[PDB]
């Protein structure tokens, strides 16, 4: 658990 | 291989293993202890005192009391899932709460020699639990021991019976055939779990719904005051006098908006929870209400005399909260104290006649201080006591010459259970025909004799045990002679 | 991952016309999966050890 | 649960010395349903008295799960074979594939 | 079900109900056809030790 | 004939002393129904079995030498390939793989599996297959009806119009009214309710005919029917240079009798299998598995109107629930409704319900001879059930009180697991002596699981889904249940044998459970026995006899079918404050619970006469209990009602006894016969706190020392024919002195007692050449049984808008003086004229079979042989009772499924 | 064989036909606005000020 730290790359493939 | 199952879903009898069983487990023990110390237990023993008289409302039902039916008396009341009232119903329910006290007391100690409290804070509060558990044991053994075991000043017994107490079980098992201890045995133990447990319990008290120490100390108050040990009974009294202040009103409407109101009684020194939901129930035989639409109707099975009528004098605050003249909508009088509580409703117009449990009271410990002082021989710290609580209820006794003091606590306590205590030790014979009835009242008023003479020192001023017991327990003495 | 598997496999010549068979398995497993584990949390996964 | 049926009868002869035939045809029918129901609870006080029916009874109160899925393949196919002498085989096939 | 128009239970109140659009829908699903031709070649060597 | 009677390898059944009866594959196959124990009454001398419905999916009560105790469970423990099962899990087995089985009763036999064998073990084994150079296939089909047993009892129903004047003269209508005034437009004029609904107003008068006064209704039409029967299985055998098989897969469909569903369907499959893999080692396994589909009619034992056979009897003749063309008219009319009532097959259409459940067995050895005389054998086994279960309201129905829907969904999981292990050693230390001596370990262990969930306020068909339901008041707390318990034994057994003349064997076992108290976990049975061959010894050579054996026997055992929880002090929710949680103690417990313990002495006689022809065995019993399982009545000083205690004793004393008999006149005729009888007295011996006489509140019984629990009502004694009243008898006040006015300090103990004494059953058979004959009976007599419908179809103050019987209509009047029914104005009770004599004797199979000859299948080698048979099952019956049945009940007979009449075909092709 | 397998809790879009169909399609249309105009939606151009 804990704060979500953002700005990810949405996997596809 | 281990081939225990225990079950999923209930918890069982067991040492603790945790503060929060710990807990549970106690309050379970408190919301026990409220159906246990009810006012309508002690009913019966007001009844039986020389101060009420049956109407033509009765079914024969409050009849056995008053008149001394010693018949019905032999075996009476019922215990079973229906219902549990009468001379069995206050058995039961006072060896239910000492069995399960025993059961927490016992599980507490366990726990506590077995180190399973994590940090310092739960060792403290586990210790001061397990005081208040060994409070609760004194007080199950203590109001067993008052109605089921002889008083010294009693004439003619069986044989046997003269020093014995009620079945000292201190272990938990509900399956126990065993005889009765002695009754200096039951009054060691009584004043050794009070004296252990005074002195864990924190100075302060922490809240009224719980066991605090001025409830300890109330309790040896009027516990050596029965025992007859005057000594010790004012020095444990005047520890908590000084703590609660007397109710101060001017007007007998302010009187029953401060003394109804239990959150706003400044008085009350152990008392249990109650709301409007959770609690809360309906004490109504002594005045036997009802509620109609908006107000309350009166139909009583059983009005006091008249001389109850006149130890009141008339600006009084009592006589209109204690005593009411609201008997045939406008004669003589009733005992209305346990009429209602106005925050215990659910809509604020339609009444519910319910009322919360209390259990101890400052009126009482000043009542004790100064009975002791007036008879240890010290007499300037009896008169003050006495002027203070009966200015403040109202109208002022002049001087004390030791009635007035009877008088005093035959007002105040009324409605309690305490008069029939009173009687044995003040040497009071009954004389229920001697007295005469209300002049309002005749026609609803019945006219009739006691079923049986009771003389001071007569055998049936304590209760008998019951009929289930002593037949499948041969090693139980009974007490009357019949 | 954790599994307590069993196999029989039977396979059998009646007579001259016929030939039966049968492969009977089952098994009792119990998973259970770090599901975490793909995001980013606080001190969560590889993300929190750098 | 997943159900399975593949019926096939082959044939295979010599319609010379050298000439190896073999005719193969079959049916298969695939199946499957699932489903997946679930149920909760919340306002537990004590670590013992947690089955799922000792609850809180008010608005902790929610709505249970359920989810259903299912297929089917329907398939027919034939295949032929040939062989010449030892050193030529050519092979031949066709199938028929419904699905849900 | 991927080819079918769809609606599902979308509540407002807790009186009646209420019905969204879920899927669009495509009444013309068919099959993904491949097509694949290969060519091969097996060899062996030193009494079939390569 | 070895018979296995517990663990180890079988003896014999000649040398063993411990009373078993074996029922061989005959008494086992092609059996219409799915309980297996029903083919069993009448055939076990001893053994009272008794099925109390007509369900398909409904399971026997089997009692071994009466009833053992009071307050717990008197059935078997059912055993099958050595792990123990219930009678619902053996439901889903094939029977056509089952290749014998044992009933073990008496603790001689059955001391081996004490705390679990005090009252009788049931021991089913199943095939392997015998070893062929070719294999074997069996191929079985069935095919049969069945409909119900007999429709007596609406013999003396009322028709249309004495019920229209019966009730119009009983001033049920009003005070002025008159026929053709009440039948006329208040009655037949209630074509107001069925013009408010769109689906019956153009209905009404053409098609539906709803109120018919002419000619009255069928209501067995309408609520009975005839049902069908599909059965098929085939089964592979076979076997080789140590290895042996048996295969089989199967099918079974029943659909019950009653209009509102109960069938029962099962596809199931089996694999057993036992390899010898070299000179010590032998590996074996038995794999069995089941999809069952099971529906039960649950409106039966409860009292609603228009339902079950309450409905066939009650309800008024002058309603239709038919329309012009003789189907069901899915709705019916009833005077005083608020919207019409619905029939059977739309009430089963509107509630759909579902039940999957998915069985697997799996056990499985390792067996190992090393030292010539030495085996040690390792078994494991594990039994998986996992059931899904769906129930569905249906919404948008007109007849229903609300427009919306409701779902219900849930999943059953339970896990039993058994390991044993077991090591035997036999051996000779001269000629003329052998010993067997066995040590072994066991461990069971069970685990039980339920969840379930609903939810409700739907508005359509297709979207009702358990999450698409109304939120806020619509919702509920789920459902979570777990039960579990372990068993941990240690047994032991001698074997000693002199010459050929004379064996006596001893048996120990140590249990311990999960259920006993937390101080005497421990338990410890004996036995010891002894079996004397008299014939060959003493007497040597006979004209007449042939064999003659004397046993003896005695042993201890116990009945742990307690409580899973029942010794422990159980602690619920007591809340001080509103919103933290309270605990206190609720229960009480007991940490000395025992397990009901119990001694049995045994005497039997066994004798073979002319050739071995005719065959008699004779067997005397004592069965003492003690330390049963009451929830007695505490002293106040508990602080609790009561506390579940061992007290008590029990004493059942009988003799049975059996014999065959074979009767040729010819070389190709064959005659066969065979009885058995059990004669049985219980007896109470002593109760709890010095107590002479208990009662079980709302049970209607009663415990006495020194008679069996009998009943516990008034007596009836008639009517007055001075003024038309009931009288009952006053207990004592002997001249007997009649009262006329019913109070409940007027009841007694009737001396008839509640488990019937007498059981029995005997059998015929001829065989001519391949054509047989069968037939089987079966008895139970001295069984009493109040018939609840009795209470309501002669009733003559209030339920007056039922149908009556048809001796109320001389009802006592001061013109019609001389009968014996009573006023109208009176209400019955439930006194002695309504316990009823429901002893019986059952035709309970009856076959003709033809085995086609050899001489047909000549010049072929596919087809090896064939069978043909007709079969009927419960075909004739003798009975007293009024009330549909007399087996189906069981101390009450309350609104029953009656027990069916089958008509059954079948073919078998063993090629 | 009929393959024919149609969602659970799913019905086909079509044309009014009822009453009580045009209430149902409206009582999803407001349920829908619920969760579009919310303040969840509306704090991104909030913070950007
Ligand atoms: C639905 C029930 C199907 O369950 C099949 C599972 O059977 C269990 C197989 O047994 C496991 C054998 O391995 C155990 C040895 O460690
Ligand atoms: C003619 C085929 C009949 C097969 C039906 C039997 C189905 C029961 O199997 C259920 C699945 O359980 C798997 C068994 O696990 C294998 C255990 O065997 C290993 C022991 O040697
Ligand atoms: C866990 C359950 C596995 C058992 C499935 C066995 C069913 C196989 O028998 C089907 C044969 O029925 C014939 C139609
Ligand atoms: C062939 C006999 C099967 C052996 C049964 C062993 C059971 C093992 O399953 C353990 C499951 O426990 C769950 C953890």
């Given at each position: 658990?804990?704060?979500?730290?953002?700005?990810?790359?949405?996997?596809?493939? | 291989?281990?081939?225990?199952?225990?079950?999923?879903?209930?918890?069982?009898?067991?040492?603790?293993?945790?503060?929060?069983?710990?807990?549970?487990?106690?309050?379970?023990?408190?919301?026990?202890?409220?159906?246990?110390?009810?006012?309508?237990?002690?009913?019966?023993?007001?009844?039986?005192?020389?101060?009420?008289?049956?109407?033509?409302?009765?079914?024969?039902?409050?009849?056995?009391?008053?008149?001394?039916?010693?018949?019905?008396?032999?075996?009476?009341?019922?215990?079973?899932?229906?219902?549990?009232?009468?001379?069995?119903?206050?058995?039961?329910?006072?060896?239910?709460?000492?069995?399960?006290?025993?059961?927490?007391?016992?599980?507490?100690?366990?726990?506590?020699?077995?180190?399973?409290?994590?940090?310092?804070?739960?060792?403290?509060?586990?210790?001061?639990?397990?005081?208040?558990?060994?409070?609760?044991?004194?007080?199950?053994?203590?109001?067993?021991?008052?109605?089921?075991?002889?008083?010294?000043?009693?004439?003619?017994?069986?044989?046997?019976?003269?020093?014995?107490?009620?079945?000292?079980?201190?272990?938990?098992?509900?399956?126990?055939?065993?005889?009765?201890?002695?009754?200096?045995?039951?009054?060691?133990?009584?004043?050794?779990?009070?004296?252990?447990?005074?002195?864990?319990?924190?100075?302060?008290?922490?809240?009224?719904?719980?066991?605090?120490?001025?409830?300890?100390?109330?309790?040896?108050?009027?516990?050596?005051?029965?025992?007859?040990?005057?000594?010790?009974?004012?020095?444990?009294?005047?520890?908590?006098?000084?703590?609660?202040?007397?109710?101060?009103?001017?007007?007998?409407?302010?009187?029953?908006?401060?003394?109804?109101?239990?959150?706003?009684?400044?008085?009350?020194?152990?008392?249990?929870?109650?709301?409007?939901?959770?609690?809360?129930?309906?004490?109504?035989?002594?005045?036997?209400?009802?509620?109609?639409?908006?107000?309350?109707?009166?139909?009583?099975?059983?009005?006091?005399?008249?001389?109850?009528?006149?130890?009141?004098?008339?600006?009084?605050?009592?006589?209109?909260?204690?005593?009411?003249?609201?008997?045939?909508?406008?004669?003589?009088?009733?005992?209305?104290?346990?009429?209602?509580?106005?925050?215990?409703?659910?809509?604020?117009?339609?009444?519910?006649?319910?009322?919360?449990?209390?259990?101890?009271?400052?009126?009482?410990?000043?009542?004790?201080?100064?009975?002791?002082?007036?008879?240890?021989?010290?007499?300037?710290?009896?008169?003050?006591?006495?002027?203070?609580?009966?200015?403040?209820?109202?109208?002022?006794?002049?001087?004390?010459?030791?009635?007035?003091?009877?008088?005093?606590?035959?007002?105040?306590?009324?409605?309690?259970?305490?008069?029939?205590?009173?009687?044995?030790?003040?040497?009071?014979?009954?004389?229920?025909?001697?007295?005469?009835?209300?002049?309002?009242?005749?026609?609803?008023?019945?006219?009739?004799?006691?079923?049986?003479?009771?003389?001071?020192?007569?055998?049936?001023?304590?209760?008998?045990?019951?009929?289930?017991?002593?037949?499948?327990?041969?090693?139980?003495?009974?007490?009357?002679?019949? | 991952?954790?599994?307590?598997?069993?196999?029989?496999?039977?396979?059998?010549?009646?007579?001259?016309?016929?030939?039966?068979?049968?492969?009977?398995?089952?098994?009792?497993?119990?998973?259970?999966?770090?599901?975490?584990?793909?995001?980013?949390?606080?001190?969560?996964?590889?993300?929190?050890?750098? | 649960?997943?159900?399975?049926?593949?019926?096939?009868?082959?044939?295979?002869?010599?319609?010379?010395?050298?000439?190896?035939?073999?005719?193969?045809?079959?049916?298969?029918?695939?199946?499957?349903?699932?489903?997946?129901?679930?149920?909760?609870?919340?306002?537990?006080?004590?670590?013992?008295?947690?089955?799922?029916?000792?609850?809180?009874?008010?608005?902790?109160?929610?709505?249970?799960?359920?989810?259903?899925?299912?297929?089917?393949?329907?398939?027919?196919?034939?295949?032929?074979?040939?062989?010449?002498?030892?050193?030529?085989?050519?092979?031949?096939?066709?199938?028929?594939?419904?699905?849900? | 079900?991927?080819?079918?128009?769809?609606?599902?239970?979308?509540?407002?109140?807790?009186?009646?109900?209420?019905?969204?659009?879920?899927?669009?829908?495509?009444?013309?699903?068919?099959?993904?056809?491949?097509?694949?031709?290969?060519?091969?070649?097996?060899?062996?060597?030193?009494?079939?030790?390569? | 004939?070895?018979?296995?009677?517990?663990?180890?390898?079988?003896?014999?059944?000649?040398?063993?002393?411990?009373?078993?009866?074996?029922?061989?594959?005959?008494?086992?196959?092609?059996?219409?129904?799915?309980?297996?124990?029903?083919?069993?009454?009448?055939?076990?001398?001893?053994?009272?079995?008794?099925?109390?419905?007509?369900?398909?999916?409904?399971?026997?009560?089997?009692?071994?030498?009466?009833?053992?105790?009071?307050?717990?469970?008197?059935?078997?423990?059912?055993?099958?390939?050595?792990?123990?099962?219930?009678?619902?899990?053996?439901?889903?087995?094939?029977?056509?793989?089952?290749?014998?089985?044992?009933?073990?009763?008496?603790?001689?036999?059955?001391?081996?599996?004490?705390?679990?064998?005090?009252?009788?073990?049931?021991?089913?084994?199943?095939?392997?297959?015998?070893?062929?150079?070719?294999?074997?296939?069996?191929?079985?089909?069935?095919?049969?009806?069945?409909?119900?047993?007999?429709?007596?009892p609406?013999?003396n129903?009322?028709?249309?119009?004495?019920?229209?004047?019966?009730?119009?003269?009983?001033?049920?209508?009003?005070?002025?009214?008159?026929?053709?005034?009440?039948?006329?437009?208040?009655?037949?004029?209630?074509?107001?309710?069925?013009?408010?609904?769109?689906?019956?107003?153009?209905?009404?008068?053409?098609?539906?005919?709803?109120?018919?006064?002419?000619?009255?209704?069928?209501?067995?039409?309408?609520?009975?029917?005839?049902?069908?029967?599909?059965?098929?299985?085939?089964?592979?055998?076979?076997?080789?240079?140590?290895?042996?098989?048996?295969?089989?897969?199967?099918?079974?469909?029943?659909?019950?009798?009653?209009?509102?569903?109960?069938?029962?369907?099962?596809?199931?499959?089996?694999?057993?299998?036992?390899?010898?893999?070299?000179?010590?080692?032998?590996?074996?396994?038995?794999?069995?598995?089941?999809?069952?589909?099971?529906?039960?009619?649950?409106?039966?034992?409860?009292y609603?109107?228009?339902?079950?056979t309450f409905?066939?009897l009650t309800?008024?003749?002058?309603?239709?629930?038919?329309?012009?063309?003789?189907?069901?008219?899915?709705?019916?009319?009833?005077?005083?409704?608020?919207?019409?009532?619905?029939?059977?097959?739309?009430?089963?259409?509107?509630?759909?319900?579902?039940?999957?459940?998915?069985?697997?067995?799996?056990?499985?050895?390792?067996?190992?001879?090393?030292?010539?005389?030495?085996?040690?054998?390792?078994?494991?086994?594990?039994?998986?059930?996992?059931?899904?279960?769906?129930?569905?309201?249906?919404?948008?129905?007109?007849?229903?009180?609300?427009?919306?829907?409701?779902?219900?969904?849930?999943?059953?999981?339970?896990?039993?697991?058994?390991?044993?292990?077991?090591?035997?050693?036999?051996?000779?230390?001269?000629?003329?002596?052998?010993?067997?001596?066995?040590?072994?370990?066991?461990?069971?262990?069970?685990?039980?699981?339920?969840?379930?969930?609903?939810?409700?306020?739907?508005?359509?068909?297709?979207?009702?889904?358990?999450?698409?339901?109304?939120?806020?008041?619509?919702?509920?707390?789920?459902?979570?249940?777990?039960?579990?318990?372990?068993?941990?034994?240690?047994?032991?057994?001698?074997?000693?044998?002199?010459?050929?003349?004379?064996?006596?064997?001893?048996?120990?076992?140590?249990?311990?459970?999960?259920?006993?108290?937390?101080?005497?976990?421990?338990?410890?049975?004996?036995?010891?026995?002894?079996?004397?061959?008299?014939?060959?010894?003493?007497?040597?050579?006979?004209?007449?006899?042939?064999?003659?054996?004397?046993?003896?026997?005695?042993?201890?055992?116990?009945?742990?079918?307690?409580?899973?929880?029942?010794?422990?002090?159980?602690?619920?929710?007591?809340?001080?404050?509103?919103?933290?949680?309270?605990?206190?103690?609720?229960?009480?417990?007991?940490?000395?619970?025992?397990?009901?313990?119990?001694?049995?002495?045994?005497?039997?006689?066994?004798?073979?006469?002319?050739?071995?022809?005719?065959?008699?065995?004779?067997?005397?019993?004592?069965?003492?209990?003690?330390?049963?399982?009451?929830?007695?009545?505490?002293?106040?000083?508990?602080?609790?009602?009561?506390?579940?205690?061992?007290?008590?004793?029990?004493?059942?004393?009988?003799?049975?006894?059996?014999?065959?008999?074979?009767?040729?006149?010819?070389?190709?005729?064959?005659?066969?016969?065979?009885?058995?009888?059990?004669?049985?007295?219980?007896?109470?011996?002593?109760?709890?706190?010095?107590?002479?006489?208990?009662?079980?509140?709302?049970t209607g019984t009663?415990?006495?020392?020194?008679?069996?629990?009998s009943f516990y009502m008034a007596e009836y004694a008639g009517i007055?024919?001075?003024?038309?009243?009931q009288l009952w008898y006053?207990?004592?006040?002997?001249?007997?002195?009649?009262?006329?006015?019913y109070?409940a300090?007027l009841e007694t103990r009737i001396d008839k007692?509640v488990?019937?004494?007498?059981?029995?059953?005997?059998?015929?058979?001829?065989?001519?050449?391949?054509?047989?004959?069968?037939?089987?009976?079966?008895?139970?007599?001295?069984k009493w049984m109040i018939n609840n419908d009795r209470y309501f179809t002669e009733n003559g103050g209030g339920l007056?808008?039922?149908?009556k019987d048809?001796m109320l209509?001389?009802?006592?009047?001061?013109?019609?003086?001389?009968?014996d029914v009573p006023?109208?104005?009176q209400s019955p009770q439930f006194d002695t004229h309504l316990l009823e004599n429901a002893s019986?004797?059952?035709?309970?199979?009856?076959?003709?079979?033809?085995?086609?000859?050899?001489?047909?299948?000549?010049?072929?080698?596919?087809?090896?042989?064939?069978?043909?048979?007709?079969?009927?099952?419960?075909?004739?019956?003798?009975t007293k009772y009024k009330g549909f049945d007399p087996?189906?009940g069981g101390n009450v007979g309350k609104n029953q499924?009656?027990?069916?009449?089958?008509?059954?075909?079948?073919?078998?092709?063993?090629?």
């Amino acid at each position: 658990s804990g704060a979500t730290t953002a700005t990810t790359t949405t996997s596809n493939s | 291989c281990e081939l225990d199952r225990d079950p999923e879903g209930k918890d069982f009898q067991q040492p603790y293993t945790s503060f929060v069983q710990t807990k549970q487990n106690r309050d379970g023990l408190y919301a026990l202890l409220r159906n246990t110390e009810n006012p309508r237990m002690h009913f019966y023993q007001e009844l039986q005192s020389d101060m009420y008289c049956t109407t033509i409302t009765d079914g024969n039902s409050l009849a056995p009391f008053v008149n001394w039916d010693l018949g019905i008396l032999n075996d009476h009341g019922r215990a079973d899932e229906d219902e549990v009232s009468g001379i069995a119903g206050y058995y039961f329910v006072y060896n239910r709460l000492n069995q399960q006290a025993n059961a927490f007391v016992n599980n507490t100690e366990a726990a506590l020699q077995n180190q399973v409290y994590k940090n310092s804070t739960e060792i403290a509060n586990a210790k001061s639990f397990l005081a208040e558990g060994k409070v609760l044991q004194a007080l199950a053994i203590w109001r067993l021991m008052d109605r089921f075991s002889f008083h010294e000043s009693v004439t003619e017994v069986n044989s046997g019976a003269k020093d014995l107490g009620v079945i000292l079980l201190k272990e938990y098992n509900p399956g126990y055939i065993g005889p009765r201890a002695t009754k200096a045995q039951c009054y060691d133990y009584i004043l050794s779990r009070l004296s252990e447990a005074i002195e864990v319990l924190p100075e302060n008290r922490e809240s009224v719904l719980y066991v605090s120490r001025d409830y300890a100390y109330a309790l040896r108050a009027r516990i050596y005051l029965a025992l007859g040990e005057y000594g010790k009974a004012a020095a444990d009294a005047k520890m908590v006098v000084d703590k609660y202040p007397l109710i101060g009103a001017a007007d007998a409407s302010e009187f029953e908006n401060i003394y109804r109101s239990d959150a706003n009684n400044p008085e009350i020194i152990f008392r249990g929870f109650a709301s409007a939901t959770l609690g809360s129930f309906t004490a109504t035989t002594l005045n036997g209400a009802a509620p109609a639409g908006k107000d309350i109707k009166y139909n009583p099975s059983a009005v006091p005399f008249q001389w109850v009528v006149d130890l009141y004098e008339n600006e009084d605050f009592r006589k209109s909260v204690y005593i009411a003249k609201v008997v045939k909508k406008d004669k003589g009088y009733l005992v209305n104290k346990f009429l209602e509580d106005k925050a215990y409703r659910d809509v604020q117009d339609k009444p519910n006649l319910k009322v919360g449990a209390r259990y101890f009271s400052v009126a009482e410990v000043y009542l004790i201080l100064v009975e002791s002082a007036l008879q240890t021989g010290d007499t300037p710290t009896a008169e003050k006591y006495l002027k203070a609580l009966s200015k403040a209820r109202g109208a002022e006794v002049s001087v004390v010459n030791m009635e007035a003091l009877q008088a005093e606590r035959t007002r105040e306590l009324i409605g309690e259970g305490s008069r029939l205590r009173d009687m044995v030790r003040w040497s009071i014979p009954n004389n229920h025909d001697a007295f005469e009835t209300q002049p309002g009242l005749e026609g609803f008023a019945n006219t009739t004799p006691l079923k049986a003479q009771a003389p001071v020192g007569f055998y049936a001023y304590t209760w008998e045990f019951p009929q289930r017991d002593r037949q499948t327990n041969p090693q139980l003495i009974k007490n009357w002679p019949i | 991952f954790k599994r307590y598997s069993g196999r029989l496999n039977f396979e059998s010549r009646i007579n001259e016309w016929l030939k039966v068979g049968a492969n009977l398995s089952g098994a009792i497993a119990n998973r259970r999966s770090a599901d975490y584990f793909g995001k980013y949390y606080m001190g969560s996964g590889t993300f929190g050890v750098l | 649960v997943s159900k399975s049926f593949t019926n096939t009868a082959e044939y295979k002869f010599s319609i010379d010395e050298k000439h190896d035939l073999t005719a193969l045809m079959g049916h298969e029918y695939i199946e499957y349903e699932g489903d997946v129901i679930g149920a909760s609870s919340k306002g537990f006080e004590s670590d013992k008295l947690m089955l799922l029916s000792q609850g809180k009874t008010g608005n902790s109160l929610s709505l249970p799960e359920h989810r259903v899925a299912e297929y089917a393949y329907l398939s027919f196919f034939s295949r032929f074979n040939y062989g010449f002498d030892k050193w030529m085989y050519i092979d031949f096939s066709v199938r028929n594939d419904q699905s849900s | 079900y991927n080819h079918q128009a769809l609606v599902t239970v979308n509540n407002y109140t807790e009186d009646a109900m209420g019905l969204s659009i879920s899927t669009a829908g495509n009444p013309d699903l068919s099959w993904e056809k491949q097509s694949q031709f290969n060519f091969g070649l097996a060899a062996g060597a030193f009494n079939n030790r390569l | 004939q070895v018979v296995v009677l517990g663990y180890g390898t079988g003896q014999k059944l000649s040398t063993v002393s411990g009373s078993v009866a074996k029922v061989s594959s005959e008494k086992l196959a092609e059996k219409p129904v799915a309980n297996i124990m029903d083919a069993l009454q009448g055939q076990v001398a001893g053994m009272q079995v008794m099925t109390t419905s007509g369900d398909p999916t409904a399971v026997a009560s089997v009692e071994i030498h009466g009833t053992g105790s009071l307050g717990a469970s008197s059935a078997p423990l059912y055993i099958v390939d050595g792990m123990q099962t219930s009678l619902d899990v053996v439901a889903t087995m094939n029977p056509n793989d089952f290749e014998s089985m044992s009933v073990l009763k008496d603790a001689s036999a059955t001391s081996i599996y004490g705390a679990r064998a005090a009252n009788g073990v049931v021991f089913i084994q199943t095939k392997k297959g015998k070893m062929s150079e070719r294999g074997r296939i069996t191929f079985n089909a069935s095919y049969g009806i069945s409909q119900i047993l007999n429709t007596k009892p609406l013999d003396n129903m009322m028709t249309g119009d004495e019920l229209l004047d019966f009730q119009v003269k009983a001033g049920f209508w009003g005070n002025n009214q008159t026929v053709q005034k009440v039948k006329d437009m208040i009655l037949a004029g209630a074509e107001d309710l069925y013009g408010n609904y769109d689906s019956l107003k153009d209905e009404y008068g053409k098609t539906l005919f709803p109120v018919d006064f002419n000619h009255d209704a069928d209501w067995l039409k309408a609520l009975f029917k005839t049902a069908p029967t599909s059965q098929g299985d085939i089964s592979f055998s076979g076997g080789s240079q140590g290895t042996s098989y048996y295969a089989s897969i199967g099918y079974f469909d029943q659909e019950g009798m009653a209009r509102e569903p109960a069938n029962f369907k099962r596809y199931s499959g089996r694999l057993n299998f036992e390899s010898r893999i070299n000179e010590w080692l032998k590996v074996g396994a038995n794999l069995s598995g089941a999809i069952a589909n099971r529906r039960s009619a649950d409106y039966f034992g409860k009292y609603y109107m228009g339902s079950g056979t309450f409905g066939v009897l009650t309800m008024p003749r002058y309603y239709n629930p038919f329309d012009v063309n003789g189907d069901l008219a899915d709705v019916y009319y009833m005077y005083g409704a608020t919207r019409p009532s619905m029939t059977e097959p739309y009430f089963a259409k509107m509630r759909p319900f579902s039940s999957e459940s998915h069985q697997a067995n799996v056990n499985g050895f390792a067996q190992i001879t090393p030292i010539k005389g030495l085996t040690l054998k390792a078994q494991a086994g594990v039994d998986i059930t996992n059931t899904r279960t769906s129930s569905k309201r249906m919404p948008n129905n007109p007849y229903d009180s609300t427009p919306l829907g409701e779902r219900r969904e849930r999943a059953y999981r339970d896990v039993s697991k058994s390991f044993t292990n077991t090591a035997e050693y036999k051996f000779s230390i001269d000629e003329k002596h052998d010993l067997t001596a066995l040590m072994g370990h066991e461990y069971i262990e069970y685990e039980g699981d339920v969840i379930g969930a609903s939810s409700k306020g739907f508005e359509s068909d297709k979207l009702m889904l358990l999450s698409q339901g109304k939120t806020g008041n619509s919702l509920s707390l789920p459902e979570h249940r777990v039960a579990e318990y372990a068993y941990l034994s240690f047994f032991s057994r001698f074997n000693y044998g002199f010459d050929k003349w004379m064996y006596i064997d001893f048996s120990v076992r140590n249990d311990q459970s999960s259920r006993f108290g937390s101080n005497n976990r421990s338990a410890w049975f004996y036995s010891v026995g002894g079996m004397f061959d008299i014939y060959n010894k003493f007497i040597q050579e006979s004209n007449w006899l042939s064999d003659l054996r004397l046993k003896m026997s005695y042993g201890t055992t116990g009945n742990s079918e307690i409580g899973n929880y029942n010794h422990q002090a159980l602690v619920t929710v007591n809340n001080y404050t509103e919103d933290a949680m309270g605990l206190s103690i609720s229960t009480a417990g007991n940490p000395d619970l025992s397990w009901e313990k119990q001694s049995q002495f045994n005497f039997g006689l066994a004798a073979g006469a002319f050739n071995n022809r005719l065959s008699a065995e004779v067997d005397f019993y004592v069965r003492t209990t003690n330390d049963m399982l009451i929830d007695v009545p505490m002293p106040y000083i508990s602080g609790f009602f009561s506390q579940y205690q061992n007290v008590g004793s029990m004493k059942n004393t009988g003799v049975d006894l059996s014999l065959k008999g074979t009767i040729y006149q010819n070389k190709d005729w064959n005659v066969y016969a065979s009885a058995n009888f059990n004669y049985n007295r219980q007896e109470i011996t002593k109760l709890f706190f010095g107590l002479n006489k208990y009662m079980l509140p709302n049970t209607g019984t009663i415990w006495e020392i020194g008679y069996p629990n009998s009943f516990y009502m008034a007596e009836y004694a008639g009517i007055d024919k001075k003024t038309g009243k009931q009288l009952w008898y006053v207990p004592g006040q002997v001249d007997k002195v009649t009262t006329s006015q019913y109070s409940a300090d007027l009841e007694t103990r009737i001396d008839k007692s509640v488990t019937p004494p007498i059981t029995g059953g005997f059998s015929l058979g001829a065989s001519w050449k391949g054509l047989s004959l069968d037939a089987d009976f079966a008895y139970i007599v001295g069984k009493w049984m109040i018939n609840n419908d009795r209470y309501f179809t002669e009733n003559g103050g209030g339920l007056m808008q039922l149908n009556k019987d048809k001796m109320l209509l001389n009802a006592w009047t001061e013109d019609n003086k001389e009968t014996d029914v009573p006023k109208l104005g009176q209400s019955p009770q439930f006194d002695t004229h309504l316990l009823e004599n429901a002893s019986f004797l059952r035709l309970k199979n009856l076959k003709l079979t033809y085995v086609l000859p050899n001489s047909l299948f000549a010049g072929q080698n596919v087809i090896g042989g064939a069978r043909v048979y007709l079969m009927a099952r419960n075909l004739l019956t003798v009975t007293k009772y009024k009330g549909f049945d007399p087996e189906a009940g069981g101390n009450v007979g309350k609104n029953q499924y009656p027990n069916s009449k089958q008509y059954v075909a079948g073919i078998q092709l063993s090629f």
